[PDB]
DNA sequence: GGTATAC
DNA sequence: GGTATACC
């Protein structure tokens, strides 16, 4: 089971409109069984619909999705979009959890893996308030545990956990980090941006031993579509300034 | 300070 | 067509 969290810079009607960009986006999503897409600025699900038309042109049940409402304090809004292969997994529940874009949490049943039921917390943090936000994920964690009696939780997204947004000294005041409950599959040494900058913005965190035991070592990593598709830096950036981070459960 | 979008 | 962001 392959899972990915992908921040697609301003996914919307414009981006999905360009048959080329769309082609690539589609190709990327298809690698996965469950993919979280962030930075969905689609008031009307017009772009999300385009995507699903492509994904499901050969069959209408290749992919189902769960999308959250537009999240944001003022006029700027983003949605959390969960795309999934209905034949490998099913939603058992979902809920909207201090945060700019409050985490959307989804619960999945997985028949084909060691771990059977697990939750995914999605987070696209605010750059300027990343520290506060990654730390609050500790609360969300506790929240999920209380509600669902579930220990197996994968927390992933464009957490902005590096460079200017989370410094070396700042990591100590982040509970999701200091707690040995959590294993950070994407190290601070990974490069997850398509730009020149070398930062580990996108991450995947896992709690619970069933899950932790279901992760295939050496499987979690950024997915550099530039290199994989021998795309030009300009083409690459046109798709997104971030790379998908992925993992494989067994 | 810049770039960029949605709406 | 100004406002509200995500980055550099
Ligand atoms: C799909 O978007 C791409 C990427 O931005 C477009 O290709 C860019 O087009 C501009 C304007 O012609 C160029 O100056 C760039 O060189 C292009 N990039 C590549 C890497 O070819 C493309 O124009 C898109 N299309 C639709 C039909 O309008």
């Amino acid at each position: 089971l392959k899972i990915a969290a992908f921040n697609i810079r301003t996914f919307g009607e414009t981006k999905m409109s360009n048959a080329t960009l769309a082609s690539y986006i589609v190709r990327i999503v298809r690698r996965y069984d469950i993919v979280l897409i962030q930075e969905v600025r689609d008031s009307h699900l017009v772009a999300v619909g385009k995507l699903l038309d492509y994904l499901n042109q050969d069959d209408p049940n290749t992919y189902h999705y769960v999308v959250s409402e537009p999240l944001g304090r003022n006029s700027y809004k983003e949605r959390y979009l969960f795309l999934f292969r209905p034949n490998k997994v099913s939603v058992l529940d979902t809920y909207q959890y201090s945060f700019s874009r409050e985490p959307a949490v989804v619960k999945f049943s997985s028949h084909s893996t060691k771990v059977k039921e697990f939750a995914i917390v999605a987070l696209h943090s605010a750059p300027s308030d990343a520290v506060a936000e990654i730390n609050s994920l500790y609360d969300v964690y506790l929240d999920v545990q209380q509600k669902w009696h579930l220990n197996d939780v994968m927390l992933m997204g464009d957490f902005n956990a590096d460079c200017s947004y989370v410094t070396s000294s700042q990591w100590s005041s982040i509970r999701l980090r200091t707690s040995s409950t959590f294993q950070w599959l994407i190290p601070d040494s990974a490069d997850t941006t398509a730009t020149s900058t070398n930062c580990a913005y996108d991450r995947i965190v896992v709690a619970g031993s069933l899950l932790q035991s279901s992760v295939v070592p050496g499987s979690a990593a950024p997915f550099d579509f530039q290199a994989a598709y021998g795309l030009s830096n300009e083409m690459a950036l046109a798709i997104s300034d971030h790379y998908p981070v992925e993992v494989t459960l067994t």
Side-chain angles (χ1 to χ4, degrees), chain A residues 1 29-30 32-35 52 55-56 59-66 82-92 108-112:
Chain A
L1 189 79
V29 155
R30 285 200 82 39
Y32 312 116
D33 294 301
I34 301 171
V35 49
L52 286 138
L55 293 167
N56 292 311
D59 176 344
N61 310 300
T62 314
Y63 283 89
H64 296 159
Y65 72 99
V66 150
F82 288 86
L83 285 176
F84 69 83
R85 290 194 139 66
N87 63 307
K88 300 313 197 253
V89 108
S90 29
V91 176
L92 299 185
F108 289 96
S109 133
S110 185
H111 275 342
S112 87

PDB file of all heavy atoms in Angstrom, chain A residues 1 29-30 32-35 52 55-56 59-66 82-92 108-112:
ATOM      1  N   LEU A   1       0.884  -1.185   0.000  1.00  0.00           N
ATOM      2  CA  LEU A   1       0.000   0.000   0.000  1.00  0.00           C
ATOM      3  C   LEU A   1       0.912   1.222   0.000  1.00  0.00           C
ATOM      4  O   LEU A   1       1.690   1.388   0.940  1.00  0.00           O
ATOM      5  CB  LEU A   1      -0.948  -0.074   1.186  1.00  0.00           C
ATOM      6  CG  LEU A   1      -2.064   0.952   1.232  1.00  0.00           C
ATOM      7  CD1 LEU A   1      -3.211   0.555   0.285  1.00  0.00           C
ATOM      8  CD2 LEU A   1      -2.617   1.000   2.647  1.00  0.00           C
ATOM      9  N   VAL A  29      -0.461  10.958  -9.202  1.00  0.00           N
ATOM     10  CA  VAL A  29      -1.521  10.433  -8.316  1.00  0.00           C
ATOM     11  C   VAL A  29      -1.728   8.940  -8.423  1.00  0.00           C
ATOM     12  O   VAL A  29      -1.979   8.219  -7.440  1.00  0.00           O
ATOM     13  CB  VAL A  29      -2.801  11.242  -8.599  1.00  0.00           C
ATOM     14  CG1 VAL A  29      -4.060  10.485  -8.252  1.00  0.00           C
ATOM     15  CG2 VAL A  29      -2.715  12.651  -8.004  1.00  0.00           C
ATOM     16  N   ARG A  30      -1.575   8.477  -9.658  1.00  0.00           N
ATOM     17  CA  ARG A  30      -1.781   7.073 -10.036  1.00  0.00           C
ATOM     18  C   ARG A  30      -0.748   6.115  -9.479  1.00  0.00           C
ATOM     19  O   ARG A  30      -0.895   4.884  -9.576  1.00  0.00           O
ATOM     20  CB  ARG A  30      -1.859   6.942 -11.560  1.00  0.00           C
ATOM     21  CG  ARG A  30      -3.163   7.430 -12.148  1.00  0.00           C
ATOM     22  CD  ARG A  30      -3.338   6.834 -13.507  1.00  0.00           C
ATOM     23  NE  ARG A  30      -3.846   5.511 -13.557  1.00  0.00           N
ATOM     24  CZ  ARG A  30      -4.737   4.738 -12.968  1.00  0.00           C
ATOM     25  NH1 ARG A  30      -5.484   4.989 -11.895  1.00  0.00           N
ATOM     26  NH2 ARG A  30      -4.921   3.489 -13.481  1.00  0.00           N
ATOM     27  N   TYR A  32      -0.098   6.094  -6.488  1.00  0.00           N
ATOM     28  CA  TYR A  32      -0.629   5.820  -5.162  1.00  0.00           C
ATOM     29  C   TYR A  32      -1.994   5.233  -4.970  1.00  0.00           C
ATOM     30  O   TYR A  32      -2.889   5.318  -5.800  1.00  0.00           O
ATOM     31  CB  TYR A  32      -0.474   7.136  -4.325  1.00  0.00           C
ATOM     32  CG  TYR A  32       0.921   7.718  -4.474  1.00  0.00           C
ATOM     33  CD1 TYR A  32       1.087   8.958  -5.065  1.00  0.00           C
ATOM     34  CD2 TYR A  32       2.067   7.026  -4.052  1.00  0.00           C
ATOM     35  CE1 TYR A  32       2.362   9.523  -5.231  1.00  0.00           C
ATOM     36  CE2 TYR A  32       3.327   7.536  -4.239  1.00  0.00           C
ATOM     37  CZ  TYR A  32       3.468   8.802  -4.810  1.00  0.00           C
ATOM     38  OH  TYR A  32       4.684   9.408  -4.959  1.00  0.00           O
ATOM     39  N   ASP A  33      -2.111   4.635  -3.782  1.00  0.00           N
ATOM     40  CA  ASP A  33      -3.305   3.991  -3.283  1.00  0.00           C
ATOM     41  C   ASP A  33      -4.111   4.977  -2.449  1.00  0.00           C
ATOM     42  O   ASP A  33      -5.329   4.789  -2.380  1.00  0.00           O
ATOM     43  CB  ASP A  33      -2.955   2.728  -2.493  1.00  0.00           C
ATOM     44  CG  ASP A  33      -2.356   1.744  -3.477  1.00  0.00           C
ATOM     45  OD1 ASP A  33      -3.115   1.439  -4.418  1.00  0.00           O
ATOM     46  OD2 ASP A  33      -1.186   1.374  -3.357  1.00  0.00           O
ATOM     47  N   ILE A  34      -3.439   5.885  -1.799  1.00  0.00           N
ATOM     48  CA  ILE A  34      -4.088   6.934  -1.005  1.00  0.00           C
ATOM     49  C   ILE A  34      -3.162   8.138  -1.227  1.00  0.00           C
ATOM     50  O   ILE A  34      -1.963   7.886  -1.058  1.00  0.00           O
ATOM     51  CB  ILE A  34      -4.143   6.703   0.537  1.00  0.00           C
ATOM     52  CG1 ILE A  34      -4.910   5.387   0.819  1.00  0.00           C
ATOM     53  CG2 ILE A  34      -4.679   7.933   1.376  1.00  0.00           C
ATOM     54  CD1 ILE A  34      -4.803   5.002   2.326  1.00  0.00           C
ATOM     55  N   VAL A  35      -3.714   9.272  -1.582  1.00  0.00           N
ATOM     56  CA  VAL A  35      -2.843  10.428  -1.726  1.00  0.00           C
ATOM     57  C   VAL A  35      -3.555  11.621  -1.138  1.00  0.00           C
ATOM     58  O   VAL A  35      -4.736  11.820  -1.453  1.00  0.00           O
ATOM     59  CB  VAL A  35      -2.253  10.603  -3.120  1.00  0.00           C
ATOM     60  CG1 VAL A  35      -3.207  10.537  -4.279  1.00  0.00           C
ATOM     61  CG2 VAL A  35      -1.479  11.946  -3.164  1.00  0.00           C
ATOM     62  N   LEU A  52     -10.854  13.923 -11.149  1.00  0.00           N
ATOM     63  CA  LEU A  52     -11.607  12.659 -11.018  1.00  0.00           C
ATOM     64  C   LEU A  52     -12.109  12.162 -12.354  1.00  0.00           C
ATOM     65  O   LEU A  52     -12.192  10.934 -12.565  1.00  0.00           O
ATOM     66  CB  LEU A  52     -12.635  12.835  -9.859  1.00  0.00           C
ATOM     67  CG  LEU A  52     -11.933  12.805  -8.484  1.00  0.00           C
ATOM     68  CD1 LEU A  52     -12.469  13.834  -7.559  1.00  0.00           C
ATOM     69  CD2 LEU A  52     -12.048  11.392  -7.955  1.00  0.00           C
ATOM     70  N   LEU A  55      -8.939  10.395 -13.732  1.00  0.00           N
ATOM     71  CA  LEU A  55      -8.600   9.246 -12.913  1.00  0.00           C
ATOM     72  C   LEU A  55      -9.564   8.097 -13.184  1.00  0.00           C
ATOM     73  O   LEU A  55      -9.122   6.936 -13.202  1.00  0.00           O
ATOM     74  CB  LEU A  55      -8.502   9.603 -11.405  1.00  0.00           C
ATOM     75  CG  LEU A  55      -7.336  10.537 -11.037  1.00  0.00           C
ATOM     76  CD1 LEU A  55      -7.532  11.062  -9.632  1.00  0.00           C
ATOM     77  CD2 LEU A  55      -6.003   9.800 -11.202  1.00  0.00           C
ATOM     78  N   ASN A  56     -10.805   8.474 -13.389  1.00  0.00           N
ATOM     79  CA  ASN A  56     -11.866   7.494 -13.607  1.00  0.00           C
ATOM     80  C   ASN A  56     -12.325   7.395 -15.047  1.00  0.00           C
ATOM     81  O   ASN A  56     -13.489   6.953 -15.223  1.00  0.00           O
ATOM     82  CB  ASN A  56     -12.987   7.746 -12.590  1.00  0.00           C
ATOM     83  CG  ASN A  56     -12.635   7.460 -11.150  1.00  0.00           C
ATOM     84  OD1 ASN A  56     -12.096   6.436 -10.738  1.00  0.00           O
ATOM     85  ND2 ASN A  56     -12.970   8.418 -10.294  1.00  0.00           N
ATOM     86  N   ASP A  59     -12.630   3.562 -15.620  1.00  0.00           N
ATOM     87  CA  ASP A  59     -13.513   2.950 -14.625  1.00  0.00           C
ATOM     88  C   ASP A  59     -13.834   4.046 -13.591  1.00  0.00           C
ATOM     89  O   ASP A  59     -12.882   4.692 -13.143  1.00  0.00           O
ATOM     90  CB  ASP A  59     -12.839   1.768 -13.953  1.00  0.00           C
ATOM     91  CG  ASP A  59     -13.610   1.091 -12.840  1.00  0.00           C
ATOM     92  OD1 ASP A  59     -14.595   1.604 -12.275  1.00  0.00           O
ATOM     93  OD2 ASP A  59     -13.193  -0.049 -12.495  1.00  0.00           O
ATOM     94  N   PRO A  60     -15.104   4.105 -13.253  1.00  0.00           N
ATOM     95  CA  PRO A  60     -15.605   5.077 -12.283  1.00  0.00           C
ATOM     96  C   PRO A  60     -15.306   4.765 -10.837  1.00  0.00           C
ATOM     97  O   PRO A  60     -15.658   5.581  -9.951  1.00  0.00           O
ATOM     98  CB  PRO A  60     -17.106   5.167 -12.603  1.00  0.00           C
ATOM     99  CG  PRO A  60     -17.463   3.831 -13.204  1.00  0.00           C
ATOM    100  CD  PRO A  60     -16.198   3.283 -13.820  1.00  0.00           C
ATOM    101  N   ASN A  61     -14.691   3.626 -10.562  1.00  0.00           N
ATOM    102  CA  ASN A  61     -14.331   3.269  -9.178  1.00  0.00           C
ATOM    103  C   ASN A  61     -12.852   2.902  -9.048  1.00  0.00           C
ATOM    104  O   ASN A  61     -12.495   1.956  -8.311  1.00  0.00           O
ATOM    105  CB  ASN A  61     -15.259   2.228  -8.566  1.00  0.00           C
ATOM    106  CG  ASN A  61     -16.725   2.598  -8.741  1.00  0.00           C
ATOM    107  OD1 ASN A  61     -17.228   3.629  -8.294  1.00  0.00           O
ATOM    108  ND2 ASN A  61     -17.363   1.691  -9.468  1.00  0.00           N
ATOM    109  N   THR A  62     -12.032   3.631  -9.776  1.00  0.00           N
ATOM    110  CA  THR A  62     -10.562   3.469  -9.701  1.00  0.00           C
ATOM    111  C   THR A  62     -10.193   4.309  -8.456  1.00  0.00           C
ATOM    112  O   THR A  62      -9.422   3.850  -7.611  1.00  0.00           O
ATOM    113  CB  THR A  62      -9.834   3.945 -10.979  1.00  0.00           C
ATOM    114  OG1 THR A  62     -10.616   3.353 -12.071  1.00  0.00           O
ATOM    115  CG2 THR A  62      -8.347   3.647 -11.104  1.00  0.00           C
ATOM    116  N   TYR A  63     -10.847   5.473  -8.369  1.00  0.00           N
ATOM    117  CA  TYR A  63     -10.672   6.374  -7.241  1.00  0.00           C
ATOM    118  C   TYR A  63     -11.896   7.092  -6.664  1.00  0.00           C
ATOM    119  O   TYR A  63     -12.609   7.739  -7.413  1.00  0.00           O
ATOM    120  CB  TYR A  63      -9.739   7.555  -7.626  1.00  0.00           C
ATOM    121  CG  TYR A  63      -8.289   7.218  -7.664  1.00  0.00           C
ATOM    122  CD1 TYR A  63      -7.741   6.747  -8.851  1.00  0.00           C
ATOM    123  CD2 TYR A  63      -7.442   7.391  -6.541  1.00  0.00           C
ATOM    124  CE1 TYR A  63      -6.389   6.454  -8.939  1.00  0.00           C
ATOM    125  CE2 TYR A  63      -6.088   7.085  -6.600  1.00  0.00           C
ATOM    126  CZ  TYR A  63      -5.592   6.632  -7.805  1.00  0.00           C
ATOM    127  OH  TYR A  63      -4.258   6.321  -7.936  1.00  0.00           O
ATOM    128  N   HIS A  64     -12.003   7.078  -5.336  1.00  0.00           N
ATOM    129  CA  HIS A  64     -13.048   7.842  -4.621  1.00  0.00           C
ATOM    130  C   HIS A  64     -12.283   8.918  -3.838  1.00  0.00           C
ATOM    131  O   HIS A  64     -11.033   8.810  -3.796  1.00  0.00           O
ATOM    132  CB  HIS A  64     -13.977   7.077  -3.683  1.00  0.00           C
ATOM    133  CG  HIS A  64     -14.829   6.088  -4.393  1.00  0.00           C
ATOM    134  ND1 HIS A  64     -15.437   5.012  -3.807  1.00  0.00           N
ATOM    135  CD2 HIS A  64     -15.102   5.990  -5.724  1.00  0.00           C
ATOM    136  CE1 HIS A  64     -16.062   4.307  -4.757  1.00  0.00           C
ATOM    137  NE2 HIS A  64     -15.856   4.873  -5.926  1.00  0.00           N
ATOM    138  N   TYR A  65     -12.961   9.896  -3.283  1.00  0.00           N
ATOM    139  CA  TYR A  65     -12.237  10.917  -2.523  1.00  0.00           C
ATOM    140  C   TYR A  65     -13.039  11.422  -1.337  1.00  0.00           C
ATOM    141  O   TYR A  65     -14.245  11.189  -1.200  1.00  0.00           O
ATOM    142  CB  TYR A  65     -11.806  12.076  -3.409  1.00  0.00           C
ATOM    143  CG  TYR A  65     -12.981  12.937  -3.811  1.00  0.00           C
ATOM    144  CD1 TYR A  65     -13.265  14.136  -3.144  1.00  0.00           C
ATOM    145  CD2 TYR A  65     -13.838  12.522  -4.829  1.00  0.00           C
ATOM    146  CE1 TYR A  65     -14.369  14.913  -3.527  1.00  0.00           C
ATOM    147  CE2 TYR A  65     -14.904  13.312  -5.231  1.00  0.00           C
ATOM    148  CZ  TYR A  65     -15.163  14.500  -4.587  1.00  0.00           C
ATOM    149  OH  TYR A  65     -16.251  15.221  -4.987  1.00  0.00           O
ATOM    150  N   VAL A  66     -12.359  12.121  -0.475  1.00  0.00           N
ATOM    151  CA  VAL A  66     -12.966  12.775   0.714  1.00  0.00           C
ATOM    152  C   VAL A  66     -12.279  14.152   0.582  1.00  0.00           C
ATOM    153  O   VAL A  66     -11.085  14.072   0.271  1.00  0.00           O
ATOM    154  CB  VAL A  66     -12.666  12.059   2.025  1.00  0.00           C
ATOM    155  CG1 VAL A  66     -12.640  13.055   3.197  1.00  0.00           C
ATOM    156  CG2 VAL A  66     -13.636  10.921   2.261  1.00  0.00           C
ATOM    157  N   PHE A  82      -8.382  13.995  -0.110  1.00  0.00           N
ATOM    158  CA  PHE A  82      -7.947  12.580   0.045  1.00  0.00           C
ATOM    159  C   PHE A  82      -8.458  11.773  -1.145  1.00  0.00           C
ATOM    160  O   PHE A  82      -9.706  11.657  -1.289  1.00  0.00           O
ATOM    161  CB  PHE A  82      -8.405  12.018   1.386  1.00  0.00           C
ATOM    162  CG  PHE A  82      -7.728  12.504   2.639  1.00  0.00           C
ATOM    163  CD1 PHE A  82      -8.130  13.646   3.289  1.00  0.00           C
ATOM    164  CD2 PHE A  82      -6.666  11.752   3.180  1.00  0.00           C
ATOM    165  CE1 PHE A  82      -7.505  14.065   4.496  1.00  0.00           C
ATOM    166  CE2 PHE A  82      -6.030  12.148   4.360  1.00  0.00           C
ATOM    167  CZ  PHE A  82      -6.449  13.310   5.036  1.00  0.00           C
ATOM    168  N   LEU A  83      -7.597  11.303  -1.993  1.00  0.00           N
ATOM    169  CA  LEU A  83      -7.936  10.491  -3.176  1.00  0.00           C
ATOM    170  C   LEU A  83      -7.658   9.040  -2.777  1.00  0.00           C
ATOM    171  O   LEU A  83      -6.658   8.891  -2.012  1.00  0.00           O
ATOM    172  CB  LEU A  83      -7.178  11.013  -4.399  1.00  0.00           C
ATOM    173  CG  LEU A  83      -7.630  12.308  -5.061  1.00  0.00           C
ATOM    174  CD1 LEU A  83      -6.709  12.711  -6.187  1.00  0.00           C
ATOM    175  CD2 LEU A  83      -9.008  12.138  -5.668  1.00  0.00           C
ATOM    176  N   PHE A  84      -8.445   8.054  -3.165  1.00  0.00           N
ATOM    177  CA  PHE A  84      -8.096   6.685  -2.675  1.00  0.00           C
ATOM    178  C   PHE A  84      -8.652   5.646  -3.597  1.00  0.00           C
ATOM    179  O   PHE A  84      -9.679   5.876  -4.272  1.00  0.00           O
ATOM    180  CB  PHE A  84      -8.488   6.561  -1.188  1.00  0.00           C
ATOM    181  CG  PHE A  84      -9.945   6.536  -0.819  1.00  0.00           C
ATOM    182  CD1 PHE A  84     -10.653   5.337  -0.899  1.00  0.00           C
ATOM    183  CD2 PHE A  84     -10.619   7.691  -0.421  1.00  0.00           C
ATOM    184  CE1 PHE A  84     -12.003   5.271  -0.621  1.00  0.00           C
ATOM    185  CE2 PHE A  84     -12.005   7.654  -0.174  1.00  0.00           C
ATOM    186  CZ  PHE A  84     -12.693   6.429  -0.260  1.00  0.00           C
ATOM    187  N   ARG A  85      -8.031   4.514  -3.705  1.00  0.00           N
ATOM    188  CA  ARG A  85      -8.363   3.351  -4.496  1.00  0.00           C
ATOM    189  C   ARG A  85      -9.326   2.546  -3.623  1.00  0.00           C
ATOM    190  O   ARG A  85      -8.913   1.773  -2.760  1.00  0.00           O
ATOM    191  CB  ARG A  85      -7.164   2.484  -4.863  1.00  0.00           C
ATOM    192  CG  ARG A  85      -6.200   3.114  -5.884  1.00  0.00           C
ATOM    193  CD  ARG A  85      -5.280   2.100  -6.408  1.00  0.00           C
ATOM    194  NE  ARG A  85      -4.964   2.128  -7.838  1.00  0.00           N
ATOM    195  CZ  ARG A  85      -4.303   3.085  -8.484  1.00  0.00           C
ATOM    196  NH1 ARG A  85      -3.990   4.150  -7.733  1.00  0.00           N
ATOM    197  NH2 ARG A  85      -3.816   3.051  -9.730  1.00  0.00           N
ATOM    198  N   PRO A  86     -10.629   2.771  -3.896  1.00  0.00           N
ATOM    199  CA  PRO A  86     -11.699   2.134  -3.177  1.00  0.00           C
ATOM    200  C   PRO A  86     -11.499   0.635  -3.083  1.00  0.00           C
ATOM    201  O   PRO A  86     -12.098   0.066  -2.152  1.00  0.00           O
ATOM    202  CB  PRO A  86     -12.945   2.452  -4.025  1.00  0.00           C
ATOM    203  CG  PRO A  86     -12.628   3.735  -4.697  1.00  0.00           C
ATOM    204  CD  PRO A  86     -11.148   3.692  -4.947  1.00  0.00           C
ATOM    205  N   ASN A  87     -10.759   0.023  -4.001  1.00  0.00           N
ATOM    206  CA  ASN A  87     -10.574  -1.413  -3.976  1.00  0.00           C
ATOM    207  C   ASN A  87      -9.463  -1.815  -3.012  1.00  0.00           C
ATOM    208  O   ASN A  87      -9.392  -3.046  -2.865  1.00  0.00           O
ATOM    209  CB  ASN A  87     -10.349  -2.112  -5.290  1.00  0.00           C
ATOM    210  CG  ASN A  87      -9.072  -1.642  -5.940  1.00  0.00           C
ATOM    211  OD1 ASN A  87      -8.932  -0.423  -6.083  1.00  0.00           O
ATOM    212  ND2 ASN A  87      -8.194  -2.569  -6.320  1.00  0.00           N
ATOM    213  N   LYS A  88      -8.707  -0.898  -2.475  1.00  0.00           N
ATOM    214  CA  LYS A  88      -7.649  -1.291  -1.510  1.00  0.00           C
ATOM    215  C   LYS A  88      -7.989  -0.842  -0.082  1.00  0.00           C
ATOM    216  O   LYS A  88      -7.392  -1.294   0.910  1.00  0.00           O
ATOM    217  CB  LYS A  88      -6.345  -0.538  -1.818  1.00  0.00           C
ATOM    218  CG  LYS A  88      -5.746  -0.752  -3.187  1.00  0.00           C
ATOM    219  CD  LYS A  88      -5.697  -2.225  -3.567  1.00  0.00           C
ATOM    220  CE  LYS A  88      -4.747  -2.460  -4.717  1.00  0.00           C
ATOM    221  NZ  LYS A  88      -5.487  -2.752  -5.985  1.00  0.00           N
ATOM    222  N   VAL A  89      -8.923   0.098   0.001  1.00  0.00           N
ATOM    223  CA  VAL A  89      -9.209   0.739   1.311  1.00  0.00           C
ATOM    224  C   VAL A  89     -10.553   1.387   1.335  1.00  0.00           C
ATOM    225  O   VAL A  89     -11.072   1.696   0.233  1.00  0.00           O
ATOM    226  CB  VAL A  89      -8.029   1.802   1.195  1.00  0.00           C
ATOM    227  CG1 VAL A  89      -8.488   3.209   0.947  1.00  0.00           C
ATOM    228  CG2 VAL A  89      -7.030   1.618   2.285  1.00  0.00           C
ATOM    229  N   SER A  90     -11.098   1.654   2.510  1.00  0.00           N
ATOM    230  CA  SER A  90     -12.401   2.335   2.638  1.00  0.00           C
ATOM    231  C   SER A  90     -12.385   3.301   3.833  1.00  0.00           C
ATOM    232  O   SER A  90     -11.663   2.960   4.750  1.00  0.00           O
ATOM    233  CB  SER A  90     -13.586   1.395   2.839  1.00  0.00           C
ATOM    234  OG  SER A  90     -13.289   0.186   3.487  1.00  0.00           O
ATOM    235  N   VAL A  91     -13.115   4.357   3.775  1.00  0.00           N
ATOM    236  CA  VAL A  91     -13.204   5.307   4.900  1.00  0.00           C
ATOM    237  C   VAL A  91     -14.127   4.654   5.899  1.00  0.00           C
ATOM    238  O   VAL A  91     -15.062   3.871   5.533  1.00  0.00           O
ATOM    239  CB  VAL A  91     -13.674   6.647   4.320  1.00  0.00           C
ATOM    240  CG1 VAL A  91     -13.912   7.738   5.345  1.00  0.00           C
ATOM    241  CG2 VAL A  91     -12.614   7.112   3.301  1.00  0.00           C
ATOM    242  N   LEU A  92     -13.898   4.840   7.186  1.00  0.00           N
ATOM    243  CA  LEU A  92     -14.698   4.233   8.253  1.00  0.00           C
ATOM    244  C   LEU A  92     -15.293   5.401   9.018  1.00  0.00           C
ATOM    245  O   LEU A  92     -16.238   5.113   9.708  1.00  0.00           O
ATOM    246  CB  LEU A  92     -13.880   3.328   9.152  1.00  0.00           C
ATOM    247  CG  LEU A  92     -13.190   2.118   8.599  1.00  0.00           C
ATOM    248  CD1 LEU A  92     -12.527   1.306   9.708  1.00  0.00           C
ATOM    249  CD2 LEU A  92     -14.150   1.218   7.846  1.00  0.00           C
ATOM    250  N   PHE A 108      -9.188   4.810   7.924  1.00  0.00           N
ATOM    251  CA  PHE A 108      -9.210   3.839   6.881  1.00  0.00           C
ATOM    252  C   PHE A 108      -9.102   2.406   7.383  1.00  0.00           C
ATOM    253  O   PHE A 108      -8.385   2.087   8.330  1.00  0.00           O
ATOM    254  CB  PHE A 108      -7.982   3.967   5.891  1.00  0.00           C
ATOM    255  CG  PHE A 108      -8.058   5.183   5.028  1.00  0.00           C
ATOM    256  CD1 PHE A 108      -7.390   6.346   5.382  1.00  0.00           C
ATOM    257  CD2 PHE A 108      -8.844   5.156   3.859  1.00  0.00           C
ATOM    258  CE1 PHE A 108      -7.438   7.479   4.582  1.00  0.00           C
ATOM    259  CE2 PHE A 108      -8.936   6.267   3.048  1.00  0.00           C
ATOM    260  CZ  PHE A 108      -8.247   7.416   3.415  1.00  0.00           C
ATOM    261  N   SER A 109      -9.763   1.585   6.618  1.00  0.00           N
ATOM    262  CA  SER A 109      -9.745   0.112   6.860  1.00  0.00           C
ATOM    263  C   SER A 109      -8.822  -0.388   5.765  1.00  0.00           C
ATOM    264  O   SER A 109      -8.911   0.090   4.610  1.00  0.00           O
ATOM    265  CB  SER A 109     -11.167  -0.379   6.883  1.00  0.00           C
ATOM    266  OG  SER A 109     -11.318  -1.530   6.100  1.00  0.00           O
ATOM    267  N   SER A 110      -7.863  -1.227   6.107  1.00  0.00           N
ATOM    268  CA  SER A 110      -6.908  -1.716   5.079  1.00  0.00           C
ATOM    269  C   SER A 110      -6.835  -3.208   5.221  1.00  0.00           C
ATOM    270  O   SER A 110      -6.275  -3.715   6.187  1.00  0.00           O
ATOM    271  CB  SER A 110      -5.609  -0.959   5.244  1.00  0.00           C
ATOM    272  OG  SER A 110      -4.693  -1.289   4.235  1.00  0.00           O
ATOM    273  N   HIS A 111      -7.431  -3.922   4.292  1.00  0.00           N
ATOM    274  CA  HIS A 111      -7.458  -5.395   4.343  1.00  0.00           C
ATOM    275  C   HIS A 111      -6.130  -6.024   3.980  1.00  0.00           C
ATOM    276  O   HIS A 111      -5.770  -7.083   4.553  1.00  0.00           O
ATOM    277  CB  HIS A 111      -8.637  -5.993   3.537  1.00  0.00           C
ATOM    278  CG  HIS A 111      -9.926  -6.047   4.324  1.00  0.00           C
ATOM    279  ND1 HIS A 111     -10.039  -5.969   5.699  1.00  0.00           N
ATOM    280  CD2 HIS A 111     -11.210  -6.199   3.860  1.00  0.00           C
ATOM    281  CE1 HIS A 111     -11.317  -6.069   6.039  1.00  0.00           C
ATOM    282  NE2 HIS A 111     -12.054  -6.210   4.947  1.00  0.00           N
ATOM    283  N   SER A 112      -5.378  -5.399   3.091  1.00  0.00           N
ATOM    284  CA  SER A 112      -4.132  -5.959   2.600  1.00  0.00           C
ATOM    285  C   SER A 112      -2.878  -5.671   3.375  1.00  0.00           C
ATOM    286  O   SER A 112      -1.834  -6.071   2.778  1.00  0.00           O
ATOM    287  CB  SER A 112      -3.849  -5.559   1.136  1.00  0.00           C
ATOM    288  OG  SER A 112      -3.164  -4.325   1.029  1.00  0.00           O
TER     289      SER A 112
END
